Design an enzyme around this catalytic site. Sequence first.
Site, PDB file in Angstrom:
ATOM      1  N   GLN A 164      -7.307  -6.669   7.798  1.00 55.62           N
ATOM      2  CA  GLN A 164      -8.256  -5.068   7.703  1.00 55.62           C
ATOM      3  C   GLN A 164      -9.501  -6.163   8.575  1.00 55.62           C
ATOM      4  O   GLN A 164      -9.211  -7.590   8.787  1.00 55.62           O
ATOM      5  CB  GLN A 164      -9.071  -5.398   6.195  1.00 55.62           C
TER       6      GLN A 164
ATOM      7  N   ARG B 131      -1.892 -20.585  20.453  1.00 56.44           N
ATOM      8  CA  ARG B 131      -1.399 -21.325  21.306  1.00 56.44           C
ATOM      9  C   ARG B 131      -0.338 -22.026  21.675  1.00 56.44           C
ATOM     10  O   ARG B 131       0.322 -23.330  21.494  1.00 56.44           O
ATOM     11  CB  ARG B 131      -1.947 -22.593  20.054  1.00 56.44           C
TER      12      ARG B 131
ATOM     13  N   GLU C 126       1.241  -0.889  -0.338  1.00 55.01           N
ATOM     14  CA  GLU C 126       0.048  -0.430   0.420  1.00 55.01           C
ATOM     15  C   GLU C 126       0.664   1.308  -0.340  1.00 55.01           C
ATOM     16  O   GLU C 126       0.715   2.597  -0.978  1.00 55.01           O
ATOM     17  CB  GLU C 126      -0.714  -0.042   1.166  1.00 55.01           C
TER      18      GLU C 126
HETATM   19  N1  LIG Z   1      -0.630  14.127  15.038  1.00 58.68           N
HETATM   20  C1  LIG Z   1       0.027  13.023  13.919  1.00 58.68           C
HETATM   21  N2  LIG Z   1      -1.197  11.825  13.522  1.00 58.68           N
HETATM   22  C2  LIG Z   1      -0.120  10.894  12.406  1.00 58.68           C
HETATM   23  C3  LIG Z   1       0.846  11.788  11.460  1.00 58.68           C
HETATM   24  N3  LIG Z   1       0.673  11.100  10.996  1.00 58.68           N
HETATM   25  C4  LIG Z   1       0.512   9.899  11.221  1.00 58.68           C
HETATM   26  N4  LIG Z   1      -0.609   9.868  12.018  1.00 58.68           N
HETATM   27  C5  LIG Z   1      -1.521   9.191  12.598  1.00 58.68           C
HETATM   28  O1  LIG Z   1      -0.591   7.688  12.428  1.00 58.68           O
HETATM   29  C6  LIG Z   1      -1.856   6.580  12.367  1.00 58.68           C
HETATM   30  C7  LIG Z   1      -0.459   5.329  11.647  1.00 58.68           C
HETATM   31  O2  LIG Z   1      -1.188   4.898  10.050  1.00 58.68           O
HETATM   32  P1  LIG Z   1      -1.608   3.227  10.073  1.00 58.68           P
HETATM   33  O3  LIG Z   1      -2.522   3.343  10.842  1.00 58.68           O
HETATM   34  O4  LIG Z   1      -0.639   2.681   9.940  1.00 58.68           O
HETATM   35  O5  LIG Z   1      -2.542   2.558   8.750  1.00 58.68           O
HETATM   36  P2  LIG Z   1      -3.273   1.060   8.873  1.00 58.68           P
HETATM   37  O6  LIG Z   1      -2.699   0.263   8.201  1.00 58.68           O
HETATM   38  O7  LIG Z   1      -4.976   1.698   8.621  1.00 58.68           O
HETATM   39  O8  LIG Z   1      -3.143   0.607  10.708  1.00 58.68           O
HETATM   40  C8  LIG Z   1      -2.452   7.311  11.219  1.00 58.68           C
HETATM   41  O9  LIG Z   1      -4.118   7.034  12.190  1.00 58.68           O
HETATM   42  C9  LIG Z   1      -2.643   8.854  11.413  1.00 58.68           C
HETATM   43  O10 LIG Z   1      -3.891   9.456  12.053  1.00 58.68           O
HETATM   44  C10 LIG Z   1       1.194  12.797  12.439  1.00 58.68           C
HETATM   45  O11 LIG Z   1       2.203  14.082  10.966  1.00 58.68           O
HETATM   46  N5  LIG Z   1       0.984  13.619  13.034  1.00 58.68           N
HETATM   47  F1  ALF Z   2      -3.911   1.939   5.732  1.00 62.84           F
HETATM   48 AL1  ALF Z   2      -5.106   1.223   6.436  1.00 62.84          AL
HETATM   49  F2  ALF Z   2      -6.406   0.738   6.999  1.00 62.84           F
HETATM   50  F3  ALF Z   2      -5.610   2.736   6.606  1.00 62.84           F
HETATM   51  F4  ALF Z   2      -4.354  -0.638   5.720  1.00 62.84           F
HETATM   52 CA   LIG Z   3      -1.694   0.177   6.379  1.00 62.00          CA
HETATM   53 CA   LIG Z   4       2.024 -24.326  16.054  1.00 59.31          CA
END
Ligand SMILES: Nc1nc2c(ncn2[C@@H]2O[C@H](COP(=O)(O)OP(=O)(O)O)[C@@H](O)[C@H]2O)c(=O)[nH]1
Ligand code: ALF
Ligand SMILES: [Ca+2]
Ligand SMILES: [Ca+2]
Lengths: 418, 147, 434, 431, 68
Positions: free
Chosen positions: A339, A397, A218
């Site tokens: 997801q 497990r 991604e």
């Molecule tokens: N305050 C702030 N929050 C951030 C920043 N960069 C990323 N985040 C947050 O950190 C999280 C990282 O993305 P992520 O959870 O790994 O994507 P996922 O694969 O859907 O779980 C997101 O919820 C963003 O809102 C930033 O520069 N400032």
């Molecule tokens: F990049 Al995502 F859930 F926001 F995998």
């Molecule tokens: Ca992600």
């Molecule tokens: Ca095992």
Amino acid sequence: SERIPPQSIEAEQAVLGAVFLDPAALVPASEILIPEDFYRAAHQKIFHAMLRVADRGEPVDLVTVTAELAASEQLEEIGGVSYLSELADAVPTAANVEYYARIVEEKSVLRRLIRTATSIAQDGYTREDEIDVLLDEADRKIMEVSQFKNIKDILVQTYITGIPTGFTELDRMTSGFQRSDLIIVAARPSVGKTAFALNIAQNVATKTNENVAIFSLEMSAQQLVMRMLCAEGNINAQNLRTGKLTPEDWGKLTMAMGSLSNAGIYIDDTPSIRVSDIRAKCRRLKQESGLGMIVIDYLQLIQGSGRSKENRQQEVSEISRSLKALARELEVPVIALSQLSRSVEQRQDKRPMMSDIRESGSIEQDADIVAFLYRDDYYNKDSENKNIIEIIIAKQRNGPVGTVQLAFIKEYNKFVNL
Amino acid sequence: SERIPPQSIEAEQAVLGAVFLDPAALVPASEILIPEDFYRAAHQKIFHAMLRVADRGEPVDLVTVTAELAASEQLEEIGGVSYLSELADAVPTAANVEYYARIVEEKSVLRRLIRTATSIAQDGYTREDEIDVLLDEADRKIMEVSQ
Amino acid sequence: RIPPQSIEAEQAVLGAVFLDPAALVPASEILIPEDFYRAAHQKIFHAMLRVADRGEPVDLVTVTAELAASEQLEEIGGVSYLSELADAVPTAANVEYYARIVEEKSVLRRLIRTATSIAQDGYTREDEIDVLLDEADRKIMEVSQRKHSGAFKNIKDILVQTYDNIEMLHNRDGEITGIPTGFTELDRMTSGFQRSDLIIVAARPSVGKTAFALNIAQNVATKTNENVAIFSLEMSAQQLVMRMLCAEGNINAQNLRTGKLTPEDWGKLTMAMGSLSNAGIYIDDTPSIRVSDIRAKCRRLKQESGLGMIVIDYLQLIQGSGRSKENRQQEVSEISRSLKALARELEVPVIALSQLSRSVEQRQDKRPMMSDIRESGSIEQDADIVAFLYRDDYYNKDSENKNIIEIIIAKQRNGPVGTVQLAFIKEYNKFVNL
Amino acid sequence: RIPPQSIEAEQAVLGAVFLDPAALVPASEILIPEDFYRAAHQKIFHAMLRVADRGEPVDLVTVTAELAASEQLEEIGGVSYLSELADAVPTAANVEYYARIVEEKSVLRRLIRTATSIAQDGYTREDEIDVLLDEADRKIMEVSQRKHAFKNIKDILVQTYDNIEMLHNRDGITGIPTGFTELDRMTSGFQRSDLIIVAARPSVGKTAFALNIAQNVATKTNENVAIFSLEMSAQQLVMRMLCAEGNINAQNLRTGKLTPEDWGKLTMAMGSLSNAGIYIDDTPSIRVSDIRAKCRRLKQESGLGMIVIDYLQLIQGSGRSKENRQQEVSEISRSLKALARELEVPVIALSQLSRSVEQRQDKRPMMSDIRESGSIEQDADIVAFLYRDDYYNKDSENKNIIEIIIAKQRNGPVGTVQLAFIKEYNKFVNL
Amino acid sequence: KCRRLKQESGLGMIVIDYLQLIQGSGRSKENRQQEVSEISRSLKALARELEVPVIALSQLSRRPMMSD
DNA sequence: TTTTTTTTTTTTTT
Ligand SMILES: Nc1nc2c(ncn2[C@@H]2O[C@H](COP(=O)(O)OP(=O)(O)O)[C@@H](O)[C@H]2O)c(=O)[nH]1
Ligand code: ALF
Ligand SMILES: [Ca+2]
Ligand SMILES: [Ca+2]
Ligand SMILES: Nc1nc2c(ncn2[C@@H]2O[C@H](COP(=O)(O)OP(=O)(O)O)[C@@H](O)[C@H]2O)c(=O)[nH]1
Ligand SMILES: Nc1nc2c(ncn2[C@@H]2O[C@H](COP(=O)(O)OP(=O)(O)O)[C@@H](O)[C@H]2O)c(=O)[nH]1
Ligand code: ALF
Ligand code: ALF
Ligand SMILES: [Ca+2]
Ligand SMILES: [Ca+2]
Ligand SMILES: [Ca+2]
Ligand SMILES: [Ca+2]
Ligand SMILES: [Ca+2]
């Protein structure tokens, strides 16, 4: 046609070997195994002797064990002292007996199952007498292939095995991140999936000496490295994004770059790979440098092997199988991000359960361990105690189920201990 | 052991027979059995037809049953009208069908148990991939056999 | 290949006529000679009707006399074929059904024949399209236009069944027309407990549902000679019998389950057991049944002993027929239907106990109304009669007049609505008249 | 055994297109490519339409360009075949006629094909006879632009005037008369083709009301009425009518405990109800299709006036699998209106109401309360609720009074009407 | 777990720390009232099968009466 | 097998 009673007498040797090497390794070994679990008649007798000597306790080394085996008629029966000598040289270290003991134990359970199943079928033709009680025995005999704290056990008295993640509380519960495990980390969108995976990858690649392969389907490699830099040096991501860095931020970055260089983390950001491709790449990196962990940035983003665009649930059902099997083949933990379906956002309580894993139930079923991320502040704008994030360990497990708490300083792309 | 699946064909014929004789004997019979409980492929089809005709309800005699069996491709598959005729004569009266039905049923359960146990052992050598979920399937597959 | 036909069935019809021969009346209401497939049967069944028009009437002699009167006796096999027809029909009391097979097969080939002649005409009369399509429309209906058979009860006929049924009633001593509960005031209002009725008895938990149902079952089984089946999904058979014993002999229930019985209690128990033996009450305590299972079991008990009542210890405890774990309201909606349909089929009152939702306890007036019935409203609707139990003392610790219990008859499409009063001596698991 | 076709006419159509080509418009309004018998023409007429969708437009060049653009130009004969098509017809001036030949031939073999498949199925599916007939009926109608020409207003106005004329030369209720004056004033029948919904809470008086209507129609008028009772038996129904016809107390009647004058009352209740001509079907599970079939036949040989259904949600669904139950009844609802429409006869469907209403202050039902699917409110030509104060009040002042709330009608006026419901006699009376 | 403890040692009572804390069998996280409606039956059924009293602790909404 | 959007009967949320 030719039916060979399941066993791994390589792994058997690896256990006995580790005991002659350590021998504190006999503790885990015996918590996991009794002598009968071993397939080879000889090993049975040896591991019995090992425990026999520990009950004195001598303790357990190549000498005392042969002394004990000769004390019964058995030293000549098990090969010579020369066989006991080979067992020692089986493994380089008595590192991770726990691993191989659990293989020997798992195989033991398999043939116990086979044996009780065949004896049920056996009895099906014979005792055509009392149908309902025959069904009770079958019920009961199949449970007994599996082997509630007493009040006394609870009176020990009042008042890592394991690639280490660097998160103490998680590591206590888990002890790595074990070779051959499939670890599923699932959570709603933008909750912290990738962040958490990347944090784990850094602490492994920098704190340990092991190599880690990350497949990002991604995000670009560039964006990944920028997340790690921010987390390594506590540099505010927005600042780093912009180039709007304070004079001390430059210091923090200079550092962060330093340590991440000798880090040894191999990133593949090809947006569409099949598991076969993943396997191929890892097989080769392990070949020439050795591999420790594989991270995949996301399971349902991986793409199917030709079976035609099948009942999509089956397509991912298959990807799921392939991954576990890859983890098994390379003898390396595989962390697969997942997801979740929207059904959680119906509940008045937004903590995920296993059912919620998006697209196919087989994922629950293949995983060695399932971790959910939950954040109160994801849903509450005002939420009291913000940066807190639950790591719900819904399945494992190895052992214990439960929740662990960490802080997720988002400005720093960083997870921290409490 | 044998490789002779448990069955009691004296008893299957006795049930089908009682139906052509009574036929109020179909009520106990069906409470106790479904068509699949019968071992012989042919009886399966016949007992099915009997119930198929009862759902109209016709009701169930040697005529209407053969009319129903011919209405599908099946009358020739189960022996002739001549086999249905034999089934009639394989019985005095239709008192206590409940008894013989429960034998047929009990034998059915036996082979269903044998069949699921062998397939567990079968799977023991193949799916050496999972251990805990293989033990779950065994747990779950053996419950499903108490019905 | 082979045109659809049943000779097994054709012969059965002709056979039944030589056996009865009042069986010719249904036969000819359903069939004309042409409906038979075999050329020979056509001729025979014609002769049969030909002789009936005199009328002779129809037996193996007169028929062969009629067949010889035309060139036909030798054409249809001998007298020896007519002799075989006699011997070749299982039970002659259902000629109606074999006739309907012969008729249904007749219609089938009539359909095939008109369909093939439509296709036939498709290639030929390529001349006027719209009138060809109209004919096809019209020619295919004229199959559907099958004659006699077609269930609409004509009112002339029903009226007779009603007069005759009324008549019967008028020569019974009288009073209760149904199965008497033994509770006078309720029986006056209801007169049984009528064959084919669904009776719902609903009330809050531990109010007295089962108690009341068991009391009715006893008084029916011991006072009358009728058999009653009780399906208990919550209590065991042994708990049920223990309730009846206490109620039959006025033995205190606590004493009875302890074994702490007075010398006269033993006497009372000895009697109670005596009368409950010749009682004939059949108890099924399997904790999960489908209505289909209930049906099956009852059908069989009525077969060999005759049934009078069915009691079901409770409706929402019964379990669904496969439709997947459907909108639960629908699931019970269906159980409801099935029960009424069972009472209808077995021509026997079915008393279904029901629970109530927490609605009523929210109200000021704690007396239940129809809406309160738990889980699906279809139950109010399906029921022939809905009885609530209300105990003032169930809610008031101190309540004036204790052991009194209202039997609120909130619904009946026999007749009158109203409340009846009884005493519920709980120490004896017993309902009594006042 | 040579399939109806008219290649000459096929060529004439294709020809006219290469000649005109505004002739493609009528051609395609009348035909799709598949209507053509010759494999080649199919492909050509497809290409023609394919090029028109750009639109190029359609001439001998662009057409061959499109045919070569797929593998097809060599398959249909050469450019030399397309050239022949041009020369085949004089001018384009009547594509309409050749098109209609191609179309008529198409219909012919569609007919032959469905007919042969009916005969085919005759030998196979010997399982269900009644549903096999219905399919034949239905499969043969589907052999047309039967769903398809507009009706011009000049013409309607005339048949409307003439109708108003005839109405006037009557005889003013228009209308099968219920015999309840106040209701009849508001409604004037009970009109042909209407769907009348009568809904009310349980044991309020639904059946009673419907039965009373059926009697007064069957005995006062000369029309036949069909009653489908899915809950009560035919006997129970007749017993209700006897009581109502003769004012015999129901309790007495169902005990046999009749007074000397009661038997008198019964004797002439039976008398009048004989020549009544009311057809009762009490099979507890029917589909609408079954209802349709039975009525169709009774109208055939005796003529029908009304259909009463003891109760819409009890009817059972056509196969669509056990669907979202709201849709299942949504469908039954449609089918019933469509039945009333086809047989040109009022259809009175009884309905239940959800428990919603029991929650209210004012226990008078509104349209929303109709149980199980809102499509019923929508499909109905007329919605009648029954309300009884004495159903809820034990003591209620003025007992036997019962409101007939006419909540919906697209004939006309909405409003409430009052009747008395003497329950002891199973009888509704005027005031 | 109880089936097994009774197997090898015999069981007398089962106490459960609280009914609405128990979690549902898969039916999707259904009308929550139905979910516990189900748990309730399962428990009674378990008490019935093991022939042993089962004491389930319960919470109350909002001297109590049964409705609560 | 699953994920999605719709209508409409139930219960229980202080
Ligand atoms: N305050 C702030 N929050 C951030 C920043 N960069 C990323 N985040 C947050 O950190 C999280 C990282 O993305 P992520 O959870 O790994 O994507 P996922 O694969 O859907 O779980 C997101 O919820 C963003 O809102 C930033 O520069 N400032
Ligand atoms: F990049 Al995502 F859930 F926001 F995998
Ligand atoms: Ca992600
Ligand atoms: Ca095992
Ligand atoms: N005094 C006394 N009362 C009892 C005894 N046993 C039961 N009761 C009461 O009698 C009634 C019988 O249970 P029941 O009402 O039939 O359960 P239901 O199915 O919910 O209606 C209960 O409401 C009890 O509280 C007893 O031994 N002594
Ligand atoms: N007093 C009395 N009331 C009766 C008698 N027969 C029927 N009823 C009442 O008449 C009504 C019949 O309503 P019905 O139309 O069958 O209910 P619906 O079909 O659901 O509307 C019910 O309210 C009964 O209580 C009787 O003999 N005496
Ligand atoms: F004891 Al109950 F419904 F409360 F049977
Ligand atoms: F109870 Al009814 F129509 F008689 F709903
Ligand atoms: Ca799998
Ligand atoms: Ca799921
Ligand atoms: Ca009860
Ligand atoms: Ca009704
Ligand atoms: Ca007349």
